[PDB]
């Protein structure tokens, strides 16, 4: 819980608990007992809804796909949906198992093949690569059930890189890849339908659990432009004769006059 | 058979529930957890760090 | 609700399973079991009684 408020009478002190220093890079400890006359207040609120586990552990949407010919593919990443990508880009390193739930409006009999990294996925339905011996697969009938399965932390390091300030190839190389793109791939999910019944919309809800965030950061203050790319200059009109005009798309509203708001 | 009943709220997917799920990739051993400095446990600890206010946000 | 899961093999009728079934006609009292001579418990006990072989089974 949060601490209670202590009483505070009139104080005439020579050590001001108000005059701090912003330059020292430390925040002030000034509680309202230092500025005014407080009363004892049994305060029992908790920030239990703010800890990383309950903050991120809510099973948001990570990606949508569309079964074209009873087949669709999705490479696991949080980079497509800005709302959850921002909550992740709060922190630098994150370590979490994830719990994938598939909300599909299809009807019939579907199959999900979690392709671990480094192998070839089925390039279409009724491919030979679907008969797999070791690639873990999930069968389900969308009516009567939502398929769900946990992927443990597949990291190749002690955490996930939300931001990576490095490359993967040495200096003189030519196809160097900035960012977190090479640092990790979580495989991919290949969906197919064995029947013909339902729609084609598949939503992948992923819930980070057993989270352990590592380095806080300034939350993203600009709308994204690409994935894995942390650009923010939006090039809105590529066709017209202004393509070289780059919007900014921030969220700082302006007020008409200071000292009047 | 032991008599069970399925009350309302028992074939649904609520995004903010707390359930256990079958581990795909069993036997999987995650890489060890090393000491990275700076671990955070609560976002309010971010909300307690001073940050500048855009006080002159005029047009 | 207690979390239960229905694995594969849990809405099926396998002829050679071993389950309990609800007794229609409850309170029914079967007639008493009297001592009839000759009770058998195992068909191999039949397979241990000598029986003639049709050794001259020509057309």
């Amino acid at each position: 819980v949060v601490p209670d408020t202590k009483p505070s009478g009139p104080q005439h002190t020579t050590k001001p608990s108000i005059l701090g220093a912003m330059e020292i890079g430390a925040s002030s400890n000034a509680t309202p007992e230092s500025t005014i006359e407080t009363r004892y207040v049994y305060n029992t609120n908790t920030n239990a809804e703010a800890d990383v586990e309950m903050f991120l552990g809510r099973s948001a949407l990570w990606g949508k796909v569309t079964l074209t010919r009873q087949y669709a593919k999705w490479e696991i990443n949080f980079q497509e949906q800005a709302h959850i990508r921002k909550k992740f880009e709060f922190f630098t390193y994150l370590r979490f198992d994830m719990e994938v739930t598939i909300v599909t409006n299809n009807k019939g009999l579907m199959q999900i093949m979690f392709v671990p990294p480094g192998i070839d996925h089925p390039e279409t339905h009724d491919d030979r690569k679907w008969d797999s011996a070791s690639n873990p697969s999930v069968f389900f009938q969308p009516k009567s059930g939502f398929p769900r399965f946990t992927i443990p932390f597949t990291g190749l390091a002690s955490a996930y890189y939300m931001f990576y300030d490095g490359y993967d190839k040495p200096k003189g190389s030519d196809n160097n890849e900035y960012g977190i793109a090479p640092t990790n791939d979580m495989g991919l999910l290949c969906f197919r339908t064995l029947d013909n019944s339902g729609g084609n919309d598949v939503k992948i809800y992923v819930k980070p659990k057993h989270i352990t965030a590592w380095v806080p950061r300034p939350p993203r203050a600009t709308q994204y432009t690409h994935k894995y790319s942390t650009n923010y200059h939006y090039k809105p009109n590529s066709s017209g004769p202004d393509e070289h005009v780059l919007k900014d798309r921030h969220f700082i509203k302006t007020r008409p006059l200071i000292s009047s708001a | 058979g032991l008599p069970t009943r399925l009350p309302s709220g028992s074939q649904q997917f609520m995004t903010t529930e707390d359930e256990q799920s079958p581990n795909i990739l069993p036997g999987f051993h995650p890489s060890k957890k090393i000491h990275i400095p700076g671990m955070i446990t609560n976002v309010m600890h971010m909300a307690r760090v001073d940050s500048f206010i855009p006080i002159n946000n005029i047009q | 609700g207690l979390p239960t899961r229905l694995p594969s093999g849990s809405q099926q009728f396998m002829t050679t399973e071993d389950e309990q079934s609800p007794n229609i006609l409850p309170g029914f009292h079967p007639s008493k079991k009297i001592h009839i001579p000759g009770m058998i418990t195992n068909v191999m006990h039949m397979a241990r009684v000598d029986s003639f072989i049709p050794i001259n089974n020509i057309q």
């Binding site: 925040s27 946990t150 659990k209 | 309010m44 | -």
Partner: peptide, 25 residues
């Protein structure tokens, strides 16, 4: 506190602010 899948990664959700706000020597 039962774990129905007999595995750690299958469990549900698990459970000092001076590292920031005072990182002085």
């Amino acid at each position: 506190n039962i774990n129905y899948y007999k595995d750690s990664a299958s469990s549900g959700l698990s459970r000092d602010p001076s590292k920031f706000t005072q990182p002085l020597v």
